[PDB]
mmCIF file of C-alpha atoms in Angstrom:
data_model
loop_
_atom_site.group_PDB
_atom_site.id
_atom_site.type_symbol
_atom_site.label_atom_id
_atom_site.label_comp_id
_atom_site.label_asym_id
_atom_site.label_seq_id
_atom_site.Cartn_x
_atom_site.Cartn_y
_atom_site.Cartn_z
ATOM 1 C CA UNK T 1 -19.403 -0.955 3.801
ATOM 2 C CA UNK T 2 -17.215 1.438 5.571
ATOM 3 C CA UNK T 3 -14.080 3.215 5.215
ATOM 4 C CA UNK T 4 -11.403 3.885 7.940
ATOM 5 C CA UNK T 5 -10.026 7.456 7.694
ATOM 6 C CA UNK T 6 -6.558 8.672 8.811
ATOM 7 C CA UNK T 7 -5.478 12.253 7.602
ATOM 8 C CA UNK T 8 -2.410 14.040 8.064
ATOM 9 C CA UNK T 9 -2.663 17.669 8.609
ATOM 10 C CA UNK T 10 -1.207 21.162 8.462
ATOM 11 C CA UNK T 11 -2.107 21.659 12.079
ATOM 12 C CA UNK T 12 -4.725 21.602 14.195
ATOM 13 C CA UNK T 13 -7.303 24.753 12.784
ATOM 14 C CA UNK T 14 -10.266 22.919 10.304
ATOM 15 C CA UNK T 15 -10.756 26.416 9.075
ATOM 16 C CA UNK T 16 -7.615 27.507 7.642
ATOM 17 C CA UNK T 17 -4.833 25.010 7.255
ATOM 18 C CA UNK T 18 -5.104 21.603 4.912
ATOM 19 C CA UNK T 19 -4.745 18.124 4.501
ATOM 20 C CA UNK T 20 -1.340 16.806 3.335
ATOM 21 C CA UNK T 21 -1.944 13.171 3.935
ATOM 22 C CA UNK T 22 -4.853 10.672 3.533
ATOM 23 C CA UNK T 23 -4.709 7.060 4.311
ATOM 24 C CA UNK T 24 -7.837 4.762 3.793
ATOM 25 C CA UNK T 25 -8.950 1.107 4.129
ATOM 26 C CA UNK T 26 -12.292 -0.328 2.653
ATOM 27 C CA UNK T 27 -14.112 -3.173 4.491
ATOM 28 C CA UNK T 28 -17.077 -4.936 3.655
ATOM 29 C CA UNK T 29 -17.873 -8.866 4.970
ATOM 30 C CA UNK T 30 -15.754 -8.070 8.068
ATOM 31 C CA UNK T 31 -12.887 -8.019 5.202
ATOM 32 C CA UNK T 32 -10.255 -5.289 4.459
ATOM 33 C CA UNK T 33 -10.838 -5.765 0.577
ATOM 34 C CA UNK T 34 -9.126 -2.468 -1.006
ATOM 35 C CA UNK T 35 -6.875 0.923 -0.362
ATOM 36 C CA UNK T 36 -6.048 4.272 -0.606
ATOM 37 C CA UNK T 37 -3.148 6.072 0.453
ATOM 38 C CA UNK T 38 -1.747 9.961 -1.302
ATOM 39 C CA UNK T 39 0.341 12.896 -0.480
ATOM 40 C CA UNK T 40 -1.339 16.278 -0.886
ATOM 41 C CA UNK T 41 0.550 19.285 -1.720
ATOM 42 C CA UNK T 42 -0.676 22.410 0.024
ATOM 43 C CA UNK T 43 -1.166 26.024 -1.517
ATOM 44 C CA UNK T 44 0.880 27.180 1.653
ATOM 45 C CA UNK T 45 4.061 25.286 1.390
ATOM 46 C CA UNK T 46 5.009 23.779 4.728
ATOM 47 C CA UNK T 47 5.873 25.396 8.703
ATOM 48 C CA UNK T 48 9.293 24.271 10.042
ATOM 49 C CA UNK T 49 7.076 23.223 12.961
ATOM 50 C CA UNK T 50 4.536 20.918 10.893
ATOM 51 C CA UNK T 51 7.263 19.113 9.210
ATOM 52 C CA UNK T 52 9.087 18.639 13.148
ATOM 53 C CA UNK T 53 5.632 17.255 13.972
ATOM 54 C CA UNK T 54 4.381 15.474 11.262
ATOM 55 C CA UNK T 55 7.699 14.041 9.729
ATOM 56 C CA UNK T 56 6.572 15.369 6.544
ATOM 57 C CA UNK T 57 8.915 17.905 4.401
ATOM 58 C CA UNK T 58 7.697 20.271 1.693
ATOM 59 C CA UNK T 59 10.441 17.945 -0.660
ATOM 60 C CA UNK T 60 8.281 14.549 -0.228
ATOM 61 C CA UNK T 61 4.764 17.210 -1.003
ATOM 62 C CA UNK T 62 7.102 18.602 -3.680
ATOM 63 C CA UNK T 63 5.974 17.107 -6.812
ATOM 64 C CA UNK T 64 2.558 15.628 -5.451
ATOM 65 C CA UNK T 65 -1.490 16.895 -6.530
ATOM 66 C CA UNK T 66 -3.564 19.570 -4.800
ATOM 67 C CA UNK T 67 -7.215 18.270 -2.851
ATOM 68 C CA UNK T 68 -8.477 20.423 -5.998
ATOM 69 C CA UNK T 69 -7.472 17.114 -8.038
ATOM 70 C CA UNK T 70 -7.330 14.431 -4.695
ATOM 71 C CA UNK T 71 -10.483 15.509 -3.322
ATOM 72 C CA UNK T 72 -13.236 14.152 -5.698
ATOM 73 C CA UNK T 73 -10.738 11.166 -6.373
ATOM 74 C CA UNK T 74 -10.790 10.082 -2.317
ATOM 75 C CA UNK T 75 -14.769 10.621 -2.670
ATOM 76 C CA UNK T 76 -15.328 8.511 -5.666
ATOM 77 C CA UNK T 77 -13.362 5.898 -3.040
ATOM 78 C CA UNK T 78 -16.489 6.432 -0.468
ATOM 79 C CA UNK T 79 -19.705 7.536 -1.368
ATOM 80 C CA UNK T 80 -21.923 4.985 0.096
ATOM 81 C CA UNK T 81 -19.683 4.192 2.779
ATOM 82 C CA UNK T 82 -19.792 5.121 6.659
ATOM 83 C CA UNK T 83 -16.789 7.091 8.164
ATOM 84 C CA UNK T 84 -14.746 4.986 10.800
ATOM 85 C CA UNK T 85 -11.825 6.840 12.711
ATOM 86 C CA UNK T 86 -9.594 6.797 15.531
ATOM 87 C CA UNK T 87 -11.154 10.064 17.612
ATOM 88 C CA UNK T 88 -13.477 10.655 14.559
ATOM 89 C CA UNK T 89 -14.075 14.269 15.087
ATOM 90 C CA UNK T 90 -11.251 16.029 13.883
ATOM 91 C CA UNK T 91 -10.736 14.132 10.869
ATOM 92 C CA UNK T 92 -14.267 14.346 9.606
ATOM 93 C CA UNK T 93 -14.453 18.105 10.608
ATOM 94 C CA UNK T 94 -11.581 18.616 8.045
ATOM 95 C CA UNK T 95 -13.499 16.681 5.369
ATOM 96 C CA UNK T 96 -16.532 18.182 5.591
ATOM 97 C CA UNK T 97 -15.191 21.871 5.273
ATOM 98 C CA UNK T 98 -12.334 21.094 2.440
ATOM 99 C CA UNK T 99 -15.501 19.137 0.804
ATOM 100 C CA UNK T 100 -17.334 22.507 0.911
ATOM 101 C CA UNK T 101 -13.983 25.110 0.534
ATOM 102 C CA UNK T 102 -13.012 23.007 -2.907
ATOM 103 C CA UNK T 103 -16.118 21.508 -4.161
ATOM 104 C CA UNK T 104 -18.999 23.482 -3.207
ATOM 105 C CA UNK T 105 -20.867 20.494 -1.740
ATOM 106 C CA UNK T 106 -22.330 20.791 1.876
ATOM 107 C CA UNK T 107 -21.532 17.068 2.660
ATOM 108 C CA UNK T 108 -22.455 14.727 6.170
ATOM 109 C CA UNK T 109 -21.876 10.746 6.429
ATOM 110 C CA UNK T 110 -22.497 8.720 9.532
ATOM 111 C CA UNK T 111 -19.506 8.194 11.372
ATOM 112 C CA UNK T 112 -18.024 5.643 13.655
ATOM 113 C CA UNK T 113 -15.409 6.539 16.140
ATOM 114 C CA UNK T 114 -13.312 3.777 17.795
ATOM 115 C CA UNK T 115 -12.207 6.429 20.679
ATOM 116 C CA UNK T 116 -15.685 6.442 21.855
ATOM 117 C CA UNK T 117 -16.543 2.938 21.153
ATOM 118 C CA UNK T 118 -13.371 1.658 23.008
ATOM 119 C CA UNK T 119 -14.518 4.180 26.110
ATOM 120 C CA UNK T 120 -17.963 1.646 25.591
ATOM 121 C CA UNK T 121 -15.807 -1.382 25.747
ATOM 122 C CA UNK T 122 -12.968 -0.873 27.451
ATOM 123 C CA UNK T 123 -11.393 0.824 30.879
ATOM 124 C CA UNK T 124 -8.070 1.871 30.542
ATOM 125 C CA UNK T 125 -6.788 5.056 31.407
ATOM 126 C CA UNK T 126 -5.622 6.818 28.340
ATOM 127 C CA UNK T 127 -7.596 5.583 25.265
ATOM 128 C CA UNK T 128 -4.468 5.999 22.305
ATOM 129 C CA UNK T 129 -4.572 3.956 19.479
ATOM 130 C CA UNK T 130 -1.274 2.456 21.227
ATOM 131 C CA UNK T 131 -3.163 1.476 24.038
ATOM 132 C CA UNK T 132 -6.628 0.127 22.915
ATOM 133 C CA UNK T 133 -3.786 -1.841 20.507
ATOM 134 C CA UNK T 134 -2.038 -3.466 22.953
ATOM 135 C CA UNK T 135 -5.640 -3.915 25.381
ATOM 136 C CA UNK T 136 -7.186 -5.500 22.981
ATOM 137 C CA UNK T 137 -3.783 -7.986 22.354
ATOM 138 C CA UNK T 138 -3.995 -7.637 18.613
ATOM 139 C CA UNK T 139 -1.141 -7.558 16.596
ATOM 140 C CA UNK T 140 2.216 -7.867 15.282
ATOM 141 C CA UNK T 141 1.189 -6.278 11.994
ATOM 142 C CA UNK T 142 3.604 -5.860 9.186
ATOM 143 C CA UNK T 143 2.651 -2.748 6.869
ATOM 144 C CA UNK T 144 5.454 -2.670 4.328
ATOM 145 C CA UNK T 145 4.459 -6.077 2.423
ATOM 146 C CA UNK T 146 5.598 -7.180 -1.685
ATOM 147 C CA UNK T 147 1.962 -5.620 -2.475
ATOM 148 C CA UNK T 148 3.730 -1.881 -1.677
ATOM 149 C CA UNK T 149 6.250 -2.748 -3.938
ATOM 150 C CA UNK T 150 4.261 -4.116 -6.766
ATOM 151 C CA UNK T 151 2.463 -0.464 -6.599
ATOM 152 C CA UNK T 152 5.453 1.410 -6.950
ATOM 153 C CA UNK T 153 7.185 -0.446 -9.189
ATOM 154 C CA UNK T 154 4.130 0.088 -11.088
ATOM 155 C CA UNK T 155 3.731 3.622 -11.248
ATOM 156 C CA UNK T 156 7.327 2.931 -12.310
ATOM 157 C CA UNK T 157 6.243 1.312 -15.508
ATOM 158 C CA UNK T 158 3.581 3.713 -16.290
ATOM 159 C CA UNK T 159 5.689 6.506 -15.856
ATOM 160 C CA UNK T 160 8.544 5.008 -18.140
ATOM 161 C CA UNK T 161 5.331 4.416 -20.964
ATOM 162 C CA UNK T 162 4.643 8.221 -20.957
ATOM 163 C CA UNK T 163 7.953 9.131 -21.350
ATOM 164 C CA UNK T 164 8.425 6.450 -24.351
ATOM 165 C CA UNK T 165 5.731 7.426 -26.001
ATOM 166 C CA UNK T 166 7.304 11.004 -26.930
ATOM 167 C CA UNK T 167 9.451 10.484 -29.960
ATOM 168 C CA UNK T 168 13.253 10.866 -29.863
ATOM 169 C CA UNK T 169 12.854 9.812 -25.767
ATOM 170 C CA UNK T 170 16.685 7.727 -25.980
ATOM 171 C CA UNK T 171 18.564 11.468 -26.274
ATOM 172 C CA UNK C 1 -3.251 -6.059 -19.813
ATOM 173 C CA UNK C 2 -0.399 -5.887 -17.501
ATOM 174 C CA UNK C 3 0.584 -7.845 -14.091
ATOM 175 C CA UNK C 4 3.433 -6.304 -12.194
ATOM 176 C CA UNK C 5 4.531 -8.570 -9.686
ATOM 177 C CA UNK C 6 6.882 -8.527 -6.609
ATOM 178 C CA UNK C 7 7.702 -11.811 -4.373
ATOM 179 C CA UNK C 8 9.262 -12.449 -1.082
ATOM 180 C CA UNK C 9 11.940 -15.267 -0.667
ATOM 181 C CA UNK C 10 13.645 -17.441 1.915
ATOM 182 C CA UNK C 11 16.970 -16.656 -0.077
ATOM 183 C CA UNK C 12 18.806 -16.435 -3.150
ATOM 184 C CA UNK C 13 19.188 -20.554 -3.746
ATOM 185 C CA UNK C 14 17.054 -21.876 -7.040
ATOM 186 C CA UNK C 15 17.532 -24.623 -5.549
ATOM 187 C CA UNK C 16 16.018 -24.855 -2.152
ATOM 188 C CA UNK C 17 14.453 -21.218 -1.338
ATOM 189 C CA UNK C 18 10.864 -20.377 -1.631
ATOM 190 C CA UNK C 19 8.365 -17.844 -2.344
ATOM 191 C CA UNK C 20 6.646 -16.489 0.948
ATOM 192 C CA UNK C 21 4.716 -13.377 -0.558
ATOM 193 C CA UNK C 22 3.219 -12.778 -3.310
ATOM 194 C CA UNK C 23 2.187 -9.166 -4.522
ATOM 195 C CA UNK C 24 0.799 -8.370 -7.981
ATOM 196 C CA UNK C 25 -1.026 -5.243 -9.705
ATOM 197 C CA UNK C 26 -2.882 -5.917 -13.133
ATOM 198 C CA UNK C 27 -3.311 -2.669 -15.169
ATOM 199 C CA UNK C 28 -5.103 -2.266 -18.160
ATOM 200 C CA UNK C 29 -5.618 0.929 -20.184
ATOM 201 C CA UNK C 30 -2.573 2.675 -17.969
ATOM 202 C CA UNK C 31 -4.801 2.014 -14.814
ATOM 203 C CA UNK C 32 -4.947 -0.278 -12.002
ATOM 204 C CA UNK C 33 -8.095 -3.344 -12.151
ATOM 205 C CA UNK C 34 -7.203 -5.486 -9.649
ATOM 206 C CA UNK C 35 -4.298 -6.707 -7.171
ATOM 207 C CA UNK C 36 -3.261 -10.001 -5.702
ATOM 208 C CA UNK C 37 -1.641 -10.421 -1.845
ATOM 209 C CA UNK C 38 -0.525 -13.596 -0.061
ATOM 210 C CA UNK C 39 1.684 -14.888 2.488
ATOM 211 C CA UNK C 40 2.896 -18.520 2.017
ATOM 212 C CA UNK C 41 3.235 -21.272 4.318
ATOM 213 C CA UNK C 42 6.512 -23.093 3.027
ATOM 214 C CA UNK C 43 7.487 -26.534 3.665
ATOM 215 C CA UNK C 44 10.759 -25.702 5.319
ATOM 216 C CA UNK C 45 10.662 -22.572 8.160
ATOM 217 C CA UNK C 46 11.715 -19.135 7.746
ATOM 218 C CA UNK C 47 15.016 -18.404 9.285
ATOM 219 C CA UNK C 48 15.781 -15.602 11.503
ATOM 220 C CA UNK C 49 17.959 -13.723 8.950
ATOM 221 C CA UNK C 50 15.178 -14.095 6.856
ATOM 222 C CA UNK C 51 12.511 -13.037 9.128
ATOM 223 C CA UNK C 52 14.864 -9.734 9.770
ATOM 224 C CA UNK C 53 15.294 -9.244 5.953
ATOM 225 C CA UNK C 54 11.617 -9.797 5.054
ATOM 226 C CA UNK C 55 9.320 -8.692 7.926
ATOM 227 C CA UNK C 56 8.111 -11.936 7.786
ATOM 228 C CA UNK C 57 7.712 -14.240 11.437
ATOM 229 C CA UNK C 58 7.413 -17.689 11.539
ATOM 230 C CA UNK C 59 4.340 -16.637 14.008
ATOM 231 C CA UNK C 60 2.768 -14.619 11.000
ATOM 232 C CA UNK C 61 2.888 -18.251 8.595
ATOM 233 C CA UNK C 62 1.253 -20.399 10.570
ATOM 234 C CA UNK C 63 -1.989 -20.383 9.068
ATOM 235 C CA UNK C 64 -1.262 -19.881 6.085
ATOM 236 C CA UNK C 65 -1.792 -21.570 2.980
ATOM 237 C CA UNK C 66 1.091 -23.723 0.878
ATOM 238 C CA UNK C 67 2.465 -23.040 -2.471
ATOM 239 C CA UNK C 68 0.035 -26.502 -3.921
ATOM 240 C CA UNK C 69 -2.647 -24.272 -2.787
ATOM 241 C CA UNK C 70 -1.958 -20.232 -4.195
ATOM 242 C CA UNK C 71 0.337 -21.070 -7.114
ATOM 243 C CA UNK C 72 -2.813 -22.321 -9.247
ATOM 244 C CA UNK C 73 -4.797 -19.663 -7.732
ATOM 245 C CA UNK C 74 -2.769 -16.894 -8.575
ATOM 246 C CA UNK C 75 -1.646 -18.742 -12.068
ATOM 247 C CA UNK C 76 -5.340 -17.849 -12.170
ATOM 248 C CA UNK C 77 -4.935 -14.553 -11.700
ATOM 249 C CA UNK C 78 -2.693 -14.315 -14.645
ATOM 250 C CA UNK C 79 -3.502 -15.985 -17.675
ATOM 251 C CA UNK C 80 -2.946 -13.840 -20.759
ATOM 252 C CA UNK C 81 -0.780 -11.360 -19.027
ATOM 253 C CA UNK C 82 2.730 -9.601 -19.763
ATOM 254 C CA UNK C 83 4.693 -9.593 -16.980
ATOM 255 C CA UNK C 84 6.739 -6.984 -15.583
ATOM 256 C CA UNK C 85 9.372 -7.202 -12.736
ATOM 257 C CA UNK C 86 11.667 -5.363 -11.265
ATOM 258 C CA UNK C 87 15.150 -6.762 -11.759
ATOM 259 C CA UNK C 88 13.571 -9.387 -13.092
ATOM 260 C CA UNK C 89 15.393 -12.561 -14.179
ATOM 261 C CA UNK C 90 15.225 -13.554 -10.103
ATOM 262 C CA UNK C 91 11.814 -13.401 -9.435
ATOM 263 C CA UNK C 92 10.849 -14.432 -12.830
ATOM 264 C CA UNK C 93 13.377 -17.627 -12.663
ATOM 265 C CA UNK C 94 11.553 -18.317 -9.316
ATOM 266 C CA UNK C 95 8.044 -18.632 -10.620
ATOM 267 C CA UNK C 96 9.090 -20.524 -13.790
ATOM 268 C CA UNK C 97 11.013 -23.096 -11.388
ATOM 269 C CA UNK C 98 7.963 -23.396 -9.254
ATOM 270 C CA UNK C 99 5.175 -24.055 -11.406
ATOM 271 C CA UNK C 100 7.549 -27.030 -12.740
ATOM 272 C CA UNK C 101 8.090 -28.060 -9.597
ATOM 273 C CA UNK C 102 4.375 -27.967 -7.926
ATOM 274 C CA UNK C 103 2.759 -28.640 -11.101
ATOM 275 C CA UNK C 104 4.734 -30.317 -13.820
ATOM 276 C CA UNK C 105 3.964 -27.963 -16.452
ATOM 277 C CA UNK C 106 7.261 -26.241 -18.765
ATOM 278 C CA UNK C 107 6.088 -22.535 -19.094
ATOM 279 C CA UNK C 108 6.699 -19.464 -20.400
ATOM 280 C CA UNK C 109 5.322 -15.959 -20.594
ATOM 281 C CA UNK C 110 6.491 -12.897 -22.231
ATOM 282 C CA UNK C 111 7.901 -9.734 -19.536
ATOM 283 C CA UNK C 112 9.524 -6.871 -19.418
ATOM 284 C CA UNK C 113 12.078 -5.603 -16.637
ATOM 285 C CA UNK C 114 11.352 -1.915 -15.563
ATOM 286 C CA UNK C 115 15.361 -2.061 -14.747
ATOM 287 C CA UNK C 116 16.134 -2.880 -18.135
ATOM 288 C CA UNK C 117 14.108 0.440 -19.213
ATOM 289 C CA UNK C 118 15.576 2.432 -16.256
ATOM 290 C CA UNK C 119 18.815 1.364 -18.181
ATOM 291 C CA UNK C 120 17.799 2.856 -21.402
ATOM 292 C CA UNK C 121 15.842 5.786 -19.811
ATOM 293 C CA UNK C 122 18.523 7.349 -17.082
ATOM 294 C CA UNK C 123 21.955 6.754 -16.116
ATOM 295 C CA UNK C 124 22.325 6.479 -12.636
ATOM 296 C CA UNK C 125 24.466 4.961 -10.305
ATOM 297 C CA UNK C 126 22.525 2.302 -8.992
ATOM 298 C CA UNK C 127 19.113 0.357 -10.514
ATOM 299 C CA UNK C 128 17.490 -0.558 -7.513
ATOM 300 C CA UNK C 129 13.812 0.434 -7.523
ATOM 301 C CA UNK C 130 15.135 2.843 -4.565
ATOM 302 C CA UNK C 131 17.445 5.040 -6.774
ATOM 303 C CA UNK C 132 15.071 4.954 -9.898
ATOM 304 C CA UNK C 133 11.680 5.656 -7.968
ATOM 305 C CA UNK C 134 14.422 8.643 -6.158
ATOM 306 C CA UNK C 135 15.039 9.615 -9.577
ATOM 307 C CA UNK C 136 11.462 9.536 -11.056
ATOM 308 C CA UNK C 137 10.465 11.496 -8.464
ATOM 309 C CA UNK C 138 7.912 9.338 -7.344
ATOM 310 C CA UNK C 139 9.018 9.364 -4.231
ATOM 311 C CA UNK C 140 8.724 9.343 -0.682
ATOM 312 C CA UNK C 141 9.848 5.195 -0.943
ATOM 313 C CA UNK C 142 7.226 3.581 1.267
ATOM 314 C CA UNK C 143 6.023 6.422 3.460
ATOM 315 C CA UNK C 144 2.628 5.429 3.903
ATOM 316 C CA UNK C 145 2.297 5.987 7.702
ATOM 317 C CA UNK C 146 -1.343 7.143 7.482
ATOM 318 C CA UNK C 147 -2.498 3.612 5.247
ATOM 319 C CA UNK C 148 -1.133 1.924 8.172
ATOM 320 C CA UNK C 149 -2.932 3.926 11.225
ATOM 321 C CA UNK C 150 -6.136 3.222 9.101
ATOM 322 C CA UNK C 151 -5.044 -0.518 9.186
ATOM 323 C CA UNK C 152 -4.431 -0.852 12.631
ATOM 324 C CA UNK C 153 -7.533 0.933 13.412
ATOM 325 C CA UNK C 154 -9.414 -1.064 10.588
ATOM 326 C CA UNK C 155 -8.041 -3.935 12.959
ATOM 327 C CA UNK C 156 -9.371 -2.647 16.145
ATOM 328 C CA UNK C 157 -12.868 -1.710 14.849
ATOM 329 C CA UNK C 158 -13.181 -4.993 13.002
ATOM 330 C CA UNK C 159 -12.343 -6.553 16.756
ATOM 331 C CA UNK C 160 -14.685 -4.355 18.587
ATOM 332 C CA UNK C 161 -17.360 -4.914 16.334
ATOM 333 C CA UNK C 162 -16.968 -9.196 16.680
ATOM 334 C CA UNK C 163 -16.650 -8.101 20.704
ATOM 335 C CA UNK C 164 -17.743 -8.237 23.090
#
């Protein structure tokens, strides 16, 4: 089984600055066959310049966990499973150290990187997700699907539950 | 146990329109055990205005299985269940009139409409999932940029790793 890793980041130092997104697919049988997607709030609230880059404001990291609590949650989502990334270095540099930094842990897991690979496999002249994407002729892929929904609207319910279950809720 | 549901349509129309997605979370003990996801070949093609509406191209049905097929299946994957929606008379309606229709059975099943309870719960000028998930603060409304790079790159390992 492995698990293919996308984090968004405070900026480009491992040592100091932190990871505000993680995104995460599970395959096994050659099958994408769960998920995992959160927002990370950072102790250091967010640059001007990361939100330009990134697209992400402190408002949307606002109200969302620390890696204190997300950390050991996204790990419990691994464990056996090896890494797979686009340009695999930098995001498994920042999981290794926050993995150490937060939860003590010296950590390592095999990795595979699809930059590399696709330098195996390819030729091409920049080696992008974008263009090993359209090399390779895959796609049209639609991302926003009723599934996306069905998870909101269900962490709608849940959250409606909590708040009904504190007497005198309807004032 | 819980299965919140969400469908994609060709349109409005009881009468003709059918259901082209399917996406459904079942929760038990305030936690999620399992999820359901299908596209749906129907008999009759998607229009443009509906492929612009849903995301969904006639290119991307092709394959697909038909309603005789996944309505069982996923009838399968509830069985016991309350049902929640949002807005939910449509989508409920839609089911209801289906499994007559593929499957000759009259049936029922309790649900609840998380739009009803936003009703209760809030005050607000609209009730579309949009304003109440705003509201809720359980927001940013499908941002989930980095799930998708991991698909698409899910997509090209999975294609290197059939390839040569």
């Amino acid at each position: 089984t492995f698990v293919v890793l996308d984090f968004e980041t405070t900026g480009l130092d491992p040592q100091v600055d932190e990871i505000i997104e993680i995104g995460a697919v599970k395959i096994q049988g050659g099958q994408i066959v769960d998920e995992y997607h959160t927002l990370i709030k950072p102790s250091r609230e967010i640059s001007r310049k990361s939100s330009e880059i990134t697209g992400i404001t402190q408002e949307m990291l606002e109200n969302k966990r620390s890696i204190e609590e997300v950390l050991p949650e996204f790990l419990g989502f691994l464990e056996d499973s090896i890494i797979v990334a686009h340009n695999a270095n930098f995001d498994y540099r920042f999981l290794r150290l926050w993995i150490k930094k937060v939860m003590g842990l010296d950590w390592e897991r095999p990795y595979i990187d699809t930059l590399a690979l696709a330098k195996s496999l390819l030729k091409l002249r920049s080696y992008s997700l974008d263009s090993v994407v359209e090399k390779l002729g895959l796609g049209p892929f639609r991302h926003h699907r009723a599934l996306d929904d069905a998870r909101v609207t269900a962490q709608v319910f849940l959250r409606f539950v909590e708040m009904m279950k504190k007497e005198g809720h309807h004032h």
